[PDB]
């Protein structure tokens, strides 16, 4: 199986970059970057995942 992926291991991080590189989460919300996405993933305890890269 081949995928396109995000590694959220280094997260959470108390501060994130202000770089806009959007990720669409499975909550159908668009996270401004990987760092916001991943902070949210880890805190979601299982319930938030990746839908696709880019704006929803």
């Amino acid at each position: 199986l081949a995928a396109v992926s995000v590694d959220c291991s280094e997260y959470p991080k108390p501060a994130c970059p202000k770089d806009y590189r959007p990720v669409c989460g499975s909550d159908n919300k668009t996270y401004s970057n990987k760092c916001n996405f991943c902070n949210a993933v880890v805190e979601s305890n299982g319930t938030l995942t990746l839908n696709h890269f880019g704006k929803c």
Copy 2:
């Protein structure tokens, strides 16, 4: 799941290297490197993913 993946989480980027090290997209197009591929994935909003590494 165990997968073979490309990490596109730091994309898009302002420019890519000219380095040849192809990736075959799910569109059966060969992308000259990972960077060119991931810049395309993040614009495809969901529709482009990895097919395999190396030229199609």
Copy 3:
């Protein structure tokens, strides 16, 4: 496919850090960090995978 993943390709390792930054395995056990988790995945021969990031 778009996934959320942990890269375990450089595992097993001789030792892991004591750093707390939990990962929940598909066995519903919480692994104190990515390194402890991946050392377990590579011994599980197929049966253990990621459930989610953070504590179970």
Copy 4:
């Protein structure tokens, strides 16, 4: 979707480390490490993938 993954982007590499960190390929062969696995993946043009980490 949550996975455990390998990134084979930096490959092929003409030489590999002699570190023994086995990967089982979907050809049901066991590759001595990530570098041997990935060299083989890229040359396989699509036909070789990950089965699981560790010896087959």
